[PDB]
Amino acid sequence: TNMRKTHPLFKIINHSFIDLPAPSNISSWWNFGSLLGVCLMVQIITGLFLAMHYTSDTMTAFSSVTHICRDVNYGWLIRYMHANGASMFFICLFLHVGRGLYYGSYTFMETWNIGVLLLFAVMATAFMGYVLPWGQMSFWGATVITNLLSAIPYIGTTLVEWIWGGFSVDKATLTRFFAFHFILPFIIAALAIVHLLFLHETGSNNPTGLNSDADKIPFHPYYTIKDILGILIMFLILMTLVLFFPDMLGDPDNYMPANPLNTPPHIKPEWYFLFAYAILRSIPNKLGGVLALILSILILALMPFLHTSKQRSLMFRPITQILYWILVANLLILTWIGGQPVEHPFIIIGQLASISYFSIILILMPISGIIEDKMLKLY
Amino acid sequence: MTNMRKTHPLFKIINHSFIDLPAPSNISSWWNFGSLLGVCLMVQIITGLFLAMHYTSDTMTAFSSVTHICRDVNYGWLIRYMHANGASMFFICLFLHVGRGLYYGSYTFMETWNIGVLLLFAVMATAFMGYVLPWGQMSFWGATVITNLLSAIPYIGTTLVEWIWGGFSVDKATLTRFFAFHFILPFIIAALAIVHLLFLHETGSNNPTGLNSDADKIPFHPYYTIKDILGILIMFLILMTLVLFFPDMLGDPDNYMPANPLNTPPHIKPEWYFLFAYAILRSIPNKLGGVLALILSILILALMPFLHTSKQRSLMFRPITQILYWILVANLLILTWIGGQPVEHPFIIIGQLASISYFSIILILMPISGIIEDKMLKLY
Amino acid sequence: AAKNVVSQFVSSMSASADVLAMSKIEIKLSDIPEGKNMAFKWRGKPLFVRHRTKKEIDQEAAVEVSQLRDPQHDLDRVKKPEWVILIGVCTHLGCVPIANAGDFGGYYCPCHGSHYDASGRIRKGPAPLNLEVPAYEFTSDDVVVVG
Amino acid sequence: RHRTKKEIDQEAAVEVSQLRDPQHDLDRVKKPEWVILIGVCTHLGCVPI
Amino acid sequence: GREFGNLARIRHVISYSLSPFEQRAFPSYFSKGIPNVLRRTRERILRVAPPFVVVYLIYTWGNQEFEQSKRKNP
Amino acid sequence: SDLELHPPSYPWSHRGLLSSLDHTSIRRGFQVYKQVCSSCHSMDYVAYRHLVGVCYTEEEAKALAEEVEVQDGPNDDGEMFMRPGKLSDYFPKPYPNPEAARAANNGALPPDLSYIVRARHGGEDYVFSLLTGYCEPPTGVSLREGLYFNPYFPGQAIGMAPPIYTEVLEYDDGTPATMSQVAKDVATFLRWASEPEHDHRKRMGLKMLLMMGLLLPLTYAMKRHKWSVLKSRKLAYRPPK
Amino acid sequence: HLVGVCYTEEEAKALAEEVEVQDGPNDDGEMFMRPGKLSDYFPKPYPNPEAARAANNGALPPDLSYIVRARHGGEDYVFSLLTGYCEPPTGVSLREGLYFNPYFPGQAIGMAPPIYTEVLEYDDGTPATMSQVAKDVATFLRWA
Ligand SMILES: CCCCCCCCCCCCCCCCCC(=O)OC[C@H](COP(=O)(O)OCCN)OC(=O)CCCCCCCCCCCCCCCCC
Ligand SMILES: CCCCCCCCCCCCCCCCCC(=O)OC[C@H](COP(=O)(O)OCCN)OC(=O)CCCCCCCCCCCCCCCCC
Ligand code: HEC
Ligand code: HEC
Ligand code: HEM
Ligand code: HEM
Ligand code: HEM
Ligand code: HEM
């Protein structure tokens, strides 16, 4: 009789959001996941309203963006919430992955792997979107990171000529980057649907890590209003970041037009790439640097096979908690070092930071897990 | 040990929809057109993705970017004419799809039919703005004619048309937002096609007999997979011979001129798959009546499930309604021909007769013929 | 909050400020002597402003609606008959007309051989319809607003 | 630039270690009689003389 | 599958609940909230804080060594 | 010199979170740019209609654009022709191309000033410190003739001759045109040129702050209600022994 | 576009060398003039369409890059238009500056008859009749 359980379209919404059993004790960190979805929609919506005025041509891209800010009604608002929403998207993404690492959520291996595919897709989307306004920093960052992607012998030079569509970064690269930047969030949305589908076969994790089937509550009305409150808090942070500090996270060098003969004194990506950048230049070999960047981002994929404790969460593991917070501290140091120029003493700090990062993820955390297992008189 | 086809969740979904789907054994070649529409949609996504890598939505550099695609990009002529003739093939597949639904009584799958009606509206809008995109003479003037026709609804027509334009005429803001909307809309079409397939797999498929086909049902694999491969390869034959041998017969030549707001062409007609509706909007000497008549022609195509008065589903056993159906099909053909003709003697009277016959056949004559056939079969 | 954000996003797709500055371009002065046709670049089109005397208006008042190629009489299209406003765009090829030429002393198309009427009608020629007249509002007689 | 032989001898007399950027000057040119290079100042693209 | 009704097997458990319409949404907010905030931060501060303390130490030392390295040698 | 002096923080009128620009200073700075800085610097992205409603009225900006020749065209005979300007015209370029600007300015290219306080670290502080920081070169360093020593320019070698001194122009509203006053006015005008949306952004942010400060405790109260059905819950156990 | 189709690369390079193309601006900051390269497009006779309308007696000579794809009949229309210049019939008055071509719509074209017997000397010993010239230029416009 009722449409909530028998109508084939409302049955999906009821199974995923209304009568879905969820753990009764999950903290605010879980809200971040829904926040990510909201950010995706926000980005897509704001991206569409940037696409009604953007002109993908090297003569009229910077000029079109200035026309959006200065002549389009509230166009400055849409452009700056697209930029700071990309930043908020990466903040929520980083805290989502940190929640996955801390509370042992990588044992859902299919969900974890669809996650790291989503992470790769959103990093590439943010890269090509940052190339899109065609300022100084867009052109030079694209040239630097694609030219170091060209480091593979006998294969990389043909791949970089194919990616550029020419001898270097030019109008063909700008137009194909516009097409790729537009179309990648829809593969991201479909992959998020597959992400949620792979999650819902087993249910969410809880901070204690235990079987929450003894005490579960429906998603409505509890986590509905909890995620609404998280959305409101996120919109506070985002609109403070747009309406009060619109270019605190930005880079001023992107506000000059792209002069191909004007090499800036410093060339950086945006902040959410910077740590990988500091793992990139921590090795004085181009193949080694690019492959080390690949391992620094794919060690998340290697993570579910590096779990040694008979427990799951870090809530009852203090030594591995200490190692996790040292890892987060090291990641913060890597971001700061990637912001910094390649001088003394930043080179040795970056080298020790990357070495400690790979040593903590690869070696030290299974050792700490087996030490705590022996310490709890079970091994 | 388990079966990874029926236990892995997305493998379970594709096994439910494509491998172990119970399909009727007797569905004819008219049932291949849904997959043809899906693969032609995918061809449109891929070819448009490769077209948008060089297109620049700007009134100074749109026609020149199209010529740069044609003459400098390697095989850019192939992808561009594949896109245009794939739009034409897409509307051929749509027309035969809706004709299959009308003939065999498939509209009694009501939510599937309405999701289809929404798909048809979205596809017609998408192809209209896509035809606007190359910024030829015919693109600009067809966009101008369609939007000034939209400006006839009372007290909100001028506001809505100047909001759609982004200005007081068709200009570069319209071209950029039309590129954005043309890029985005087929993904909404793809999502609605997923919903279309969802509703259809809940309600089951239909056979040409219109009977309950659950007595004799066969798996989708390998039977309809190999039938769909044969149909897809036949459609590629037709599409590729019309790309490589007759690339410029379904369009108009004066789309190969740049857009001029001063010069107007004498024959301002849309693409061929709009022409029948064009005849309807010239069948009335009132602009609001023409706009209303167009949208309620597509809406009586939506309202078709409510007019079913016969006690048989398909037209296999109903010859009077078969004759009326083919009269309607030929009426659509001459509506297309009249829409492809100038407003002159004797095309006004023929267009008016075609419009009133079309609406009389859909509304009045077909349920009366169903009542007559039920009386003639001693039902009532 | 929802009404404000939705209204801002809808109002972003309206006509921008450069379009508004390029839509009500021409705010005419009275620097036009009695009888002279002068040209403006309004909305990407040649816009003609000509002063007229009532002798020529009464001479053109003997053009019947029934014998016109496109029926439009010479009494209702202008509220001020001494000032006439035209669009200088041919409907045949998109050329410019030049006034006070022909047997009628009307506009002439040098591209084409066609002699337009001085009110803007196609008198002799294969142009299918006349010269269109835009919308225009009346302030004090030094200044006329077009739009 | 078609260079001069005195400039060739002077630049071949340049020590490798005293240069700011480590690169061999004999291997810089293929033919020792001509110089072919980007004429772009690495600040912002000023044209040198 | 994973719906309510067959999630687990619990025996001998009694739960008592009130309406939300007759209990306060902030029952002794500060007077019971401040001691639990101090208890939670006392339980977690020795695991969380000293890595960020040494982050601040490395940050200040790196800035000072960089400004010293840019300084010349009289 | 590799080490670079940083500009200090000046107590601007628009420095605060809710403090807008001073539009009289924007007007005086536009007068400074038109009289002095427009000879070598361009502002291609700012039009004369942008000044209406900010620092000039409609007829004032109409006259100020009508006193500018704009190369309109093409004519019906097929040529360019000079015309008086209008409100839809942008600020005129000093040079037709960057290489003529290089030829007239000893090789150095004077940058476009539409985004120059958004493109420098320091912004209007940097612009004020550059314009007011001109001084004679110290010993040891001997710079090339036609260059000028400026400790705030990166590299300390600017190709711009110092354009600011006392009474370099007049003020129609009766203000003493000193060095620092002219530099402050033109820095305020440059901040307005980079961000014309600045005051509207701060007003919308104030409305955002008030609305969020209203909305957050109410939504938190709804969460506490619909979760206080669960947070007061008590559980008991009845083992049969 | 002429290499590998009609000319060799040295022949097309020599053809483009006789072209004199606007380029710049130079180091001194102004337009200058150079011989053309292979990457130089075919030269416009007029800098803008208004001078084209001024020189050619009002009427605008169109761009013949899509003119076989922008006319019904294709190159049959081009061949019929170039070879169809005849006198006007009885009664119709032809204005000076206009010529009677029955294949042009309106039958009053602004194009003077541009070809006749031996209007150019071919380099392959071809008879330069008006029909041969029209057929060759129609084939070239179909290729273009
Ligand atoms: C035996 C310890 C006794 C401690 C007694 C403290 C006082 C007790 C009475 C008052 C109550 C205070 C609050 C109680 C909190 C919980 C209990 C507690 O004190 O735990 C101690 C805590 C965790 O205990 P546990 O894991 O056993 O310690 C191993 C030490 N590594 O361990 C700690 O706090 C120690 C944490 C040390 C972390 C050092 C990290 C150094 C390296 C950082 C590198 C960061 C990256 C640098 C850059 C790299 C590249 C250059
Ligand atoms: C009278 C007997 C039937 C006809 C003669 C045939 C006799 C055959 C006798 C031997 C049997 C041979 C085998 C029979 C096979 C099956 C039966 C069959 O084919 O019947 C003929 C058929 C259908 O006949 P049925 O539907 O029964 O007749 C209607 C009754 N009320 O088809 C017909 O009846 C023909 C229908 C023709 C319809 C013509 C419509 C003309 C107008 C179309 C306008 C379209 C455009 C409109 C545009 C408007 C705007 C301008
Ligand atoms: C012609 C003599 C000029 C006058 C008048 C003004 N400027 Fe200028 N400016 C000029 C040149 C040739 C340069 C380049 C200097 C170089 O060495 O490359 C500049 C530069 C600037 C800059 C940019 C400085 C930077 O670090 O990027 C600014 C911000 C600037 N000038 C400001 C400015 C103002 C506000 C002026 C009006 C008072 C002004 N300049 C006048 C040439 C000339
Ligand atoms: C200068 C005398 C010209 C010569 C040499 C050629 N053409 Fe031309 N052409 C010229 C004008 C002024 C016009 C406009 C005519 C009008 O009525 O507006 C044209 C037009 C054409 C066209 C277009 C016809 C149409 O229906 O649109 C074509 C196809 C054309 N001309 C062909 C053509 C060829 C092939 C020429 C080389 C032999 C040629 N023209 C030379 C002016 C002149
Ligand atoms: C594209 C951005 C992403 C989106 C939109 C997204 C979306 C979601 C959503 C909606 C949930 C369910 C709500 C929740 O539990 O938080 C979720 C959970 C989860 N996601 Fe993601 N996610 C993203 C990125 C990632 C990444 C990069 C990873 C892998 C590191 C990941 C791994 C997980 C895991 C493991 C869970 C399970 C939570 C648990 O039970 O503990 N996600 N995600
Ligand atoms: C389909 C959705 C999207 C569309 C159509 C889109 C479109 C655009 C356009 C047109 C621009 C250039 C305009 C400008 O720079 O202000 C842009 C910039 C950008 N986009 Fe997107 N975008 C989309 C989704 C995303 C997503 C999901 C991200 C985050 C990963 C993102 C990150 C960025 C960034 C960082 C910029 C550069 C902002 C800057 O100028 O500094 N975009 N996008
Ligand atoms: C966007 C284009 C469309 C696509 C991609 C599409 C896709 C499909 C597919 C894949 C099927 C199943 C295979 C088949 O029966 O041919 C189908 C069936 C169906 N579609 Fe569509 N369709 C489209 C347009 C429409 C429209 C416009 C209508 C409504 C007039 C419609 C109504 C139906 C019905 C009633 C069926 C079931 C027929 C039966 O079971 O025998 N479809 N469609
Ligand atoms: C999201 C996928 C699509 C993209 C990215 C896309 C992109 C484009 C682009 C860039 C053009 C301009 C190229 C040109 O006109 O020569 C174009 C034209 C066109 N598109 Fe699409 N399109 C897509 C899907 C579709 C669909 C589904 C249809 C309808 C079947 C369609 C119909 C057309 C038409 C009719 C033209 C005009 C062709 C012409 O006249 O040259 N497009 N499209």
Ligand code: FES
């Ligand atoms: S082209 Fe002007 S009237 Fe014919």
